[PDB]
Amino acid sequence: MTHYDVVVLGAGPGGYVAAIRAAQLGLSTAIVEPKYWGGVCLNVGCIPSKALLRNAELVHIFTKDAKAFGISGEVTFDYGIAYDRSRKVAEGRVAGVHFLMKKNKITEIHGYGTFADANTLLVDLNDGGTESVTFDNAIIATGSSTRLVPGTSLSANVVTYEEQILSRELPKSIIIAGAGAIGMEFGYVLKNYGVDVTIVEFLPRALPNEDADVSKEIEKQFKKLGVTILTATKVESIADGGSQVTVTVTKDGVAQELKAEKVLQAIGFAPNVEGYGLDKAGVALTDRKAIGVDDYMRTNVGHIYAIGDVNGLLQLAHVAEAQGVVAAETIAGAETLTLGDHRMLPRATFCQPNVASFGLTEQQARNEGYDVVVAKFPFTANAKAHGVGDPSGFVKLVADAKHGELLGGHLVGHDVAELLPELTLAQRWDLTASELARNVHTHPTMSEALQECFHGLVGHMINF
Amino acid sequence: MTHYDVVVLGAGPGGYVAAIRAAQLGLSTAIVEPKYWGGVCLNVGCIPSKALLRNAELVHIFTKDAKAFGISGEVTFDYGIAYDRSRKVAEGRVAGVHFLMKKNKITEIHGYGTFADANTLLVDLNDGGTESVTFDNAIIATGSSTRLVPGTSLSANVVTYEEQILSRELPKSIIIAGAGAIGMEFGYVLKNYGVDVTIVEFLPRALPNEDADVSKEIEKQFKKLGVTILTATKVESIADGGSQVTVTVTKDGVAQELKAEKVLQAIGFAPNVEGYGLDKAGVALTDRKAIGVDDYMRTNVGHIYAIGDVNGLLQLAHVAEAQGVVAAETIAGAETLTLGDHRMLPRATFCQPNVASFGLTEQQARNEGYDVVVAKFPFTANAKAHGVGDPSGFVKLVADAKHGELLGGHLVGHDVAELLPELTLAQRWDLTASELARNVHTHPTMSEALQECFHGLVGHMINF
Numbered sequence: 062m063t064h065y066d067v068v069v070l071g072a073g074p075g076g077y078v079a080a081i082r083a084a085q086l087g088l089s090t091a092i093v094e095p096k097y098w099g100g101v102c103l104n105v106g107c108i109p110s111k112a113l114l115r116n117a118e119l120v121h122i123f124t125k126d127a128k129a130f131g132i133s134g135e136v137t138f139d140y141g142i143a144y145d146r147s148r149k150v151a152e153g154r155v156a157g158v159h160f161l162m163k164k165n166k167i168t169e170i171h172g173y174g175t176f177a178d179a180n181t182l183l184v185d186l187n188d189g190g191t192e193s194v195t196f197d198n199a200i201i202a203t204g205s206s207t208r209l210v211p212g213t214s215l216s217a218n219v220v221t222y223e224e225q226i227l228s229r230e231l232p233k234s235i236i237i238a239g240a241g242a243i244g245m246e247f248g249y250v251l252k253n254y255g256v257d258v259t260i261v262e263f264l265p266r267a268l269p270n271e272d273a274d275v276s277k278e279i280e281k282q283f284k285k286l287g288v289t290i291l292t293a294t295k296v297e298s299i300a301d302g303g304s305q306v307t308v309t310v311t312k313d314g315v316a317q318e319l320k321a322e323k324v325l326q327a328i329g330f331a332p333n334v335e336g337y338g339l340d341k342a343g344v345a346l347t348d349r350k351a352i353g354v355d356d357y358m359r360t361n362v363g364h365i366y367a368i369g370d371v372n373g374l375l376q377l378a379h380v381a382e383a384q385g386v387v388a389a390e391t392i393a394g395a396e397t398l399t400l401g402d403h404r405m406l407p408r409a410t411f412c413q414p415n416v417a418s419f420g421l422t423e424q425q426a427r428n429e430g431y432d433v434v435v436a437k438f439p440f441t442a443n444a445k446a447h448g449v450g451d452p453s454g455f456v457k458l459v460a461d462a463k464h465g466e467l468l469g470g471h472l473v474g475h476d477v478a479e480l481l482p483e484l485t486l487a488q489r490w491d492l493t494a495s496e497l498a499r500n501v502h503t504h505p506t507m508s509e510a511l512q513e514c515f516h517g518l519v520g521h522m523i524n525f
Numbered sequence: 526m527t528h529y530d531v532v533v534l535g536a537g538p539g540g541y542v543a544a545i546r547a548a549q550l551g552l553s554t555a556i557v558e559p560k561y562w563g564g565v566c567l568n569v570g571c572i573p574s575k576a577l578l579r580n581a582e583l584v585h586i587f588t589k590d591a592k593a594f595g596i597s598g599e600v601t602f603d604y605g606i607a608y609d610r611s612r613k614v615a616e617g618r619v620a621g622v623h624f625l626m627k628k629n630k631i632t633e634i635h636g637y638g639t640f641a642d643a644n645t646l647l648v649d650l651n652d653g654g655t656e657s658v659t660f661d662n663a664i665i666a667t668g669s670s671t672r673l674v675p676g677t678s679l680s681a682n683v684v685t686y687e688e689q690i691l692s693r694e695l696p697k698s699i700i701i702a703g704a705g706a707i708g709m710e711f712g713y714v715l716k717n718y719g720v721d722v723t724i725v726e727f728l729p730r731a732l733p734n735e736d737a738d739v740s741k742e743i744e745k746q747f748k749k750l751g752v753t754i755l756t757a758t759k760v761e762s763i764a765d766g767g768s769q770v771t772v773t774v775t776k777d778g779v780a781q782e783l784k785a786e787k788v789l790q791a792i793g794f795a796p797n798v799e800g801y802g803l804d805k806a807g808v809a810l811t812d813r814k815a816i817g818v819d820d821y822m823r824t825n826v827g828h829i830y831a832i833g834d835v836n837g838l839l840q841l842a843h844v845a846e847a848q849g850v851v852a853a854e855t856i857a858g859a860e861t862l863t864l865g866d867h868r869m870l871p872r873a874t875f876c877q878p879n880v881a882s883f884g885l886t887e888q889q890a891r892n893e894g895y896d897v898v899v900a901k902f903p904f905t906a907n908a909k910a911h912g913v914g915d916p917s918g919f920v921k922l923v924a925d926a927k928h929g930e931l932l933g934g935h936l937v938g939h940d941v942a943e944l945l946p947e948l949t950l951a952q953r954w955d956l957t958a959s960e961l962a963r964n965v966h967t968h969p970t971m972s973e974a975l976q977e978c979f980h981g982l983v984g985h986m987i988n989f
């Protein structure tokens with residue numbers, strides 16, 4: 062029965078960053094985690110899947126583009142090796158999280174935590190014992206779980222992201238339910254390694270959260286690659302017959318049966334809020350079953366905070382990091398800044414070409430009452446894009462006319478995920494298109510296409 | 526005879542961008558160019574060499590890293606195809622420059638221009654005639670030429686960048702004189718395609734303009750790749766015997782003879798200031814034989830301007846673009862902003878790993894009297910760098926302590942050239958480490974290593 066200044070529940074990107082920041086500000090800190098050090102992101106999420114996406118990108122060059130680059134010979138690819146490497150990359154970052162806990166003198170507690178009241182946590186230890194832990198403040202960072210198509214269930218041939226990304230062998234065909242970011246990245250990896258792929262989306266666009274021009278471009282690329290995308294289609298039933306799975310879908314009111322060897326459910330994530338005594342601590346849920354928080358990540362209980370995917374605001378790893386810093390600085394009384402409108406935070410999809418965006422789409426800005434100026438620059442006019450061998454996609458910026466303040470930005474192209482930091486820095490600190498248009502960009506880079514769209518917003522695009 | 530508001534001499538990155546900007550501001554414009562539309566950059570410089578660097582990067586993956594990525598089979602590479610592609614990329618951008626001239630109603634004049642006085646230009650036409658052209662203002666954008674090792678001369682087996690980049694065949698061995706950016710990129714391409722390469726630098730570091738930590742890292746990578754770099758060595762003589770070239774060098778006062786099939790002279794560039802009547806117009810040269818200019822690119826003659834490599838300030842294509850915009854806005858009387866200290870402008874080297882930098886090195890900032898705070902973050906702590914398969918290099922930021930204003934930045938790693946725009950935007954508009962440290966970066970990207978160094982400058986690096 063020991064006492065800490067701050068206990069952290071869960072050790073993913075939000076939880077372990079918050080604990081470090083609380084250790085930097087002088088608070089005595091403990092972190093409780095039963096399974097994944099590094100949470101979903103480092104163990105079965107962002108990190109391992111980027112390693113697999115890199116492999117898939119090279120298969121797609123060393124086969125589709127071989128003649129163009131002067132590459133000859135019979136080249137084969139082993140997916141087993143790609144899997145072996147993704148697990149070594151993951152293991153290397155988990156070792157990093159343990160080194161960081163040790164460096165900062167954070168007490169790791171290996172177990173599953175449950176609130177006994179507003180200041181007491183009862184932990185069930187992995188080693189078989191029990192531990193009690195009183196605190197002054199607590200940070201809940203327990204993540205989310207996979208949401209299932211209503212009526213269906215998991216089974217041998219119906220799986221979630223976790224069983225797929227840990228499979229060393231591939232199926233002959235697969236149906237992916239959901240055209241979000243995670244679904245498109247599994248489609249992209251599996252199609253490049255010879256799997257027959259179909260993606261079923263309920264909304265009429267793939268990546269329905271992106272600007273409509275971005276959805277149209279990415280649906281064109283995926284069709285070229287050979288993936289079949291069925292939009293405006295509803296999954297009704299999933300039946301696992303052992304040898305194959307029959308997925309019944311409806312579109313335009315007509316029933317249709319698809320078939321594959323596997324089905325991947327990837328329609329979304331529900332916060333984890335059950336089983337660890339949130340009611341004993343008095344913490345209140347929202348109407349969507351998330352933990353409600355204010356702008357400083359504080360729940361309805363004054364000393365309890367909730368960060369990351371468990372509050373549902375925006376379920377990305379860097380958002381969870383930023384929220385944990387706010388939470389920790391708020392507990393210590395240090396200088397902090399709120400994140401603000403979570404629509405302005407960046408996000409990306411890491412198929413090739415990448416998709417990267419922030420802020421409002423053109424249509425969201427018109428519906429909210431701004432005076433909208435749009436500038437669009439294609440990568441066929443970018444010298445670097447031609448040199449790399451992939452000149453597709455574009456840059457599209459949305460701004461307000463009265464001063465030229467940035468409202469959003471939407472990029473599709475080769476590695477565009479790296480080009481967002483200039484844009485979000487200008488939006489957060491109130492730099493206009495006039496200031497941005499004066500920043501000189503190294504030639505030749507993909508980032509020069511940003512400079513061209515800055516000039517377009519002030520009224521004189523030069524190179525297009 | 527015919528009169529224009531503005532005549533532009535030379536049609537490279539500076540000249541053709543200035544003409545477009547002068548066309549946008551309402552001035553009637555003519556541009557005189559005998560040979561290269563797009564100048565050195567688009568025809569035999571930046572653009573074609575990036576296409577060759579991309580090819581070399583893929584040879585280096587599909588041979589050195591094949592086993593790690595699960596790539597098997599006998600793979601051969603043809604350098605002839607790489608050359609064919611680099612010439613198709615170049616031709617495609619030259620067609621772009623002509624389309625832009627047509628769109629903006631700029632009069633192209635195909636010939637070599639010579640000043641007759643302060644307002645008259647005599648042009649010798651490629652078609653064989655002569656033309657006279659009076660102007661109100663003139664922009665000189667005539668570029669630079671290769672500088673030769675003192676005492677040596679060009680010949681069959683001793684060449685400059687222009688004859689090398691236009692060679693479809695490769696030599697068995699080559700000695701590159703000069704370890705600047707252009708020399709290292711030719712070394713990198715030729716070594717990956719099986720050429721035996723030696724690079725002789727007079728200064729004691731490779732890339733002597735970079736921060737010493739960047740030079741040490743890049744000399745390690747090149748040694749690993751198999752290139753021999755001789756630093757603090759002086760080229761004395763070059764003798765072309767027909768079958769081989771004997772290069773006599775001295776280091777520590779001891780004479781030594783090297784041998785190769787070819788020698789590439791790549792020690793620098795001298796502005797072009799002879800032969801086209803700069804003395805008839807009254808334009809004054811500096812002591813280094815450049816055209817002198819003030820902060821608005823104006824020569825000692827009130828209506829004549831000089832942009833790009835011909836003024837010698839910083840010989841890069843994007844600098845030439847930025848100067849042409851200033852020049853054109855100054856002639857039209859439009860709102861303009863000077864570029865300022867040219868040391869703050871970004872620059873990059875496009876071998877793999879890239880080198881990217883801006884501003885002052887750590888040692889330059891100490892010698893100039895600042896209170897220097899340094900933050901260094903390695904890419905072995907970057908999750909994305911591990912996923913791509915190249916976790917080498919680092920990020921190093923130099924700042925001033927009193928407010929945390931940025932003084933410089935120095936990056937070596939995979940595609941880091943794209944990460945400079947956030948840094949130069951903060952330096953030009955006076956954003957401190959405190960503001961930068963609040964910008965959220967998409968996870969996982971190479972750019973997160975910037976965010977870590979921002980935290981290091983304000984005193985709390987989290988992930989390392």
Ligand SMILES: Cc1cc2nc3c(=O)[nH]c(=O)nc-3n(C[C@H](O)[C@H](O)[C@H](O)COP(=O)(O)OP(=O)(O)OC[C@H]3O[C@@H](n4cnc5c(N)ncnc54)[C@H](O)[C@@H]3O)c2cc1C
Nearest residue numbers: 071073074075100101102106107174203204369370377378
């Ligand atoms: C395939 C895939 C790819 C993704 N790719 C990206 C990407 O490229 N970029 C991106 O930004 N995001 C990506 N994500 C999302 C990212 O994984 C999550 O947004 C992130 O992990 C959320 O962080 P968190 O710490 O809030 O939650 P988690 O990472 O889920 O952390 C929760 C942790 O708390 C533990 N826990 C739960 N209950 C308790 C309890 N009672 N006591 C103790 N511990 C408990 C859990 O075991 C878990 O380890 C991806 C996700 C998936 C599935």
Ligand SMILES: Cc1cc2nc3c(=O)[nH]c(=O)nc-3n(C[C@H](O)[C@H](O)[C@H](O)COP(=O)(O)OP(=O)(O)OC[C@H]3O[C@@H](n4cnc5c(N)ncnc54)[C@H](O)[C@@H]3O)c2cc1C
Nearest residue numbers: 535537538539564565566570571638667668833834841842
């Ligand atoms: C191999 C190589 C790689 C390079 N890579 C890069 C890179 O990655 N990034 C970068 O920023 N820079 C790079 N550079 C440098 C870049 O090419 C130059 O900085 C740039 O071209 C300078 O632009 P400019 O328009 O001032 O000169 P130029 O491009 O040389 O333009 C001068 C033009 O004027 C014409 N001209 C000359 N005299 C007259 C006259 N009397 N009348 C009419 N026309 C005339 C010439 O024919 C020529 O076409 C590279 C250079 C080389 C050689």
Ligand SMILES: Cc1cc(S(=O)(=O)N(C)CC(=O)Nc2ccc3c(c2)OCCN3C2COC2)c2[nH]c(C#N)cc2c1
Nearest residue numbers: 441442443444509510513524525538618621622624842
């Ligand atoms: C010095 C330098 C040179 C280049 S550039 O070499 O790429 N170039 C000359 C531009 C170009 O090509 N424009 C163009 C213009 C027209 C077209 C077209 C392309 O594509 C095919 C189609 N058509 C036309 C449009 O109706 C059909 C740069 N690009 C960027 C960026 N971003 C910065 C930059 C800086």
Ligand SMILES: Cc1cc(S(=O)(=O)N(C)CC(=O)Nc2ccc3c(c2)OCCN3C2COC2)c2[nH]c(C#N)cc2c1
Nearest residue numbers: 074154157158160378905906907908973974977988989
């Ligand atoms: C959520 C998340 C996760 C990761 S992370 O997965 O990469 N990770 C856990 C950090 C890490 O590994 N630190 C580390 C710590 C130690 C070490 C080491 C590495 O390398 C090998 C050597 N040693 C130690 C140092 O003495 C030997 C992130 N990195 C970035 C950036 N930039 C942002 C980011 C955000």
